[PDB]
Amino acid sequence: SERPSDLVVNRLVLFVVKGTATSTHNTVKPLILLEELGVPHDIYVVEKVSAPWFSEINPHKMVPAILDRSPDGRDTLRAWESTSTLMYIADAYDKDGTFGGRNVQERSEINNWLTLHTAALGPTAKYWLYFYKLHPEKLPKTIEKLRSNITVQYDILERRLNEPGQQYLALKDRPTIADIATLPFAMKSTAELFGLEFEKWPKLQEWSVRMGEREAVKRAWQRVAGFGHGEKEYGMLE
Amino acid sequence: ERPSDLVVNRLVLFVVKGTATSTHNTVKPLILLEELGVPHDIYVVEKVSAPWFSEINPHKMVPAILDRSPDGRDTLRAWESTSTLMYIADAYDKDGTFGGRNVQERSEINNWLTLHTAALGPTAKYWLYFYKLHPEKLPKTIEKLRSNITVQYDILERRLNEPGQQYLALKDRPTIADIATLPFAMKSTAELFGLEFEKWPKLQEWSVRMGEREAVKRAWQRVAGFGHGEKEYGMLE
Ligand SMILES: N[C@@H](CCC(=O)N[C@@H](CS[C@@]1(Cc2ccccc2)NC(=O)[C@](S)(CO)NC1=O)C(=O)NCC(=O)O)C(=O)O
Numbered sequence: 001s002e003r004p005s006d007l008v009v010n011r012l013v014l015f016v017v018k019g020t021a022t023s024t025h026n027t028v029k030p031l032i033l034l035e036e037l038g039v040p041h042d043i044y045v046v047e048k049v050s051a052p053w054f055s056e057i058n059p060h061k062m063v064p065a066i067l068d069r070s071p072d073g074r075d076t077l078r079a080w081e082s083t084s085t086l087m088y089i090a091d092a093y094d095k096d097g098t099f100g101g102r103n104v105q106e107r108s109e110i111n112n113w114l115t116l117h118t119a120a121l122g123p124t125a126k127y128w129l130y131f132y133k134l135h136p137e138k139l140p141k142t143i144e145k146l147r148s149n150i151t152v153q154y155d156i157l158e159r160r161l162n163e164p165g166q167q168y169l170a171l172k173d174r175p176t177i178a179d180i181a182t183l184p185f186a187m188k189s190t191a192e193l194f195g196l197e198f199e200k201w202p203k204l205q206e207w208s209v210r211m212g213e214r215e216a217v218k219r220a221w222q223r224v225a226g227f228g229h230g231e232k233e234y235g236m237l238e
Numbered sequence: 239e240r241p242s243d244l245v246v247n248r249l250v251l252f253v254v255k256g257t258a259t260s261t262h263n264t265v266k267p268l269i270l271l272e273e274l275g276v277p278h279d280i281y282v283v284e285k286v287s288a289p290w291f292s293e294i295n296p297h298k299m300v301p302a303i304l305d306r307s308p309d310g311r312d313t314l315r316a317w318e319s320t321s322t323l324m325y326i327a328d329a330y331d332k333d334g335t336f337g338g339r340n341v342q343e344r345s346e347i348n349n350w351l352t353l354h355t356a357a358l359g360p361t362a363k364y365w366l367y368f369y370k371l372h373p374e375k376l377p378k379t380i381e382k383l384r385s386n387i388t389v390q391y392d393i394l395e396r397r398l399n400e401p402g403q404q405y406l407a408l409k410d411r412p413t414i415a416d417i418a419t420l421p422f423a424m425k426s427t428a429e430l431f432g433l434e435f436e437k438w439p440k441l442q443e444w445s446v447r448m449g450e451r452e453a454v455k456r457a458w459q460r461v462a463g464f465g466h467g468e469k470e471y472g473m474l475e
Contacts, residue, residue, distance in 0.1 A: 060353060077341070079345055081349065081352035083352045084353075088345050088348060104307060109315075111316070111325060111328075116297060119320065123356055123360035
């Protein structure tokens with residue numbers, strides 16, 4: 001179809017939906033990294049991700065998605081899938097690799113822990129929530145297995161954060177796009193949604209609190225809850 | 239402690255014995271190694287549950303990589319098939335032939351690579367897990383995962399019907415996005431899922447075009463053969 005009247009690309013545009021307890025856990029990831037790097041950006045609140053105009057931006061028809069100007073400003077490019085939005089923002093805006101990785105060694109571990117989330121906890125959590133409340137019929141045995149698979153992912157993260165000096169998932173010294181991608185599915189509130197006691201993974205809990213105390217993370221959680229509840233319900237925010 | 243025959247004089251790719259279902263992820267890094275002509279060893283892991291292997295991949299699966307850092311100071315590791323592709327591209331694809339030359343190329347490569355990593359990859363794995371490995375058969379779950387595979391095929395079909403779009407990410411050449419997607423988007427794997435792959439003609443054409451690449455042929459031949467040659471387990475000659 002046609003782009004809405006109010007959709008223009010003068011800078012990075014992050015596509016989101018109306019903030020709810022379960023609508024923000026993927027969209028908050030690129031928003032954390034934008035807040036961390038202080039990247040100039042707009043927010044577009046999509047009413048319907050099923051709308052044909054949106055599929056042209058993200059053929060998977062989900063948020064988050066990004067439209068941005070190419071480095072020279074002549075062309076517009078796109079990023080979609082939360083992990084891909086983190087990789088794009090790091091590529092375009094994190095030139096000294098503070099969150100992307102400064103060398104092959106740092107990027108090897110960042111990509112390991114980022115991909116572990118993208119392949120395992122991320123999709124498992126998405127399937128858990130889908131079967132738990134979106135699938136027309138309730139399938140408790142499938143829901144229970146997916147819940148059990150989440151505990152195995154928590155076990156792997158817990159083991160990593162028990163290693164000497166390992167303050168963050170990828171690097172010892174600082175948080176990376178691996179930590180940002182993992183945080184929304186490895187914090188107390190999300191653990192409680194899954195029906196899990198988060199205190200059973202103490203180093204992972206400590207890690208999640210340490211991440212949550214970062215000012216950029218606080219600002220991202222604030223803003224993502226508010227999107228679509230302000231003066232403008234849908235479209236390009238002021 | 240590591241086995242005596244495990245040494246890292248070059249990139250070491252960890253695999254298991256080649257079977258009908260054991261190679262769909264390990265073949266991915268092997269394809270890119272073959273494409274770039276990276277010097278490498280193959281280590282056939284008998285038990286991925288072995289404590290020594292959990293030190294290399296805490297997720298206890300193949301593929302996994304041990305390699306020397308470019309400066310030679312560190313022994314790096316890569317694990318998760320998508321991450322092994324990202325590492326090999328980072329360390330050995332100087333010109334970004336498979337990794338992407340600029341921000342614009344990498345934007346689309348990372349889009350289609352991640353779509354596989356998050357959607358078709360894990361959906362396929364969950365399908366096979368419930369279909370044959372879960373103690374109980376759950377037909378309604380298996381059907382929904384099968385339905386989700388067709389939705390991913392539909393997305394890939396739509397992409398390959400765009401003007402001049404010969405590959406998933408870039409128009410002109412295949413990338414690590416194409417390598418990651420191929421093993422779960424070819425006729426043999428489509429048949430395993432109980433799907434008729436002719437229903438996605440551009441996707442089938444793409445899968446044939448990929449399969450005709452010499453690096454891809456060599457990768458498929460070698461991955462099937464691992465553990466069935468002179469040596470059953472450990473470092474191959
Ligand atoms: N997220 C990771 C997961 C890799 C992984 O699952 N590796 C499996 C064999 S790869 C496959 C393929 C496949 C899946 C579905 C349909 C066809 C092929 N084969 C499998 O048999 C299993 S183990 C089934 O769950 N899972 C897999 O992903 C392994 O280590 N097996 C050891 C053994 O048990 O001896 C990645 O993408 O790298």
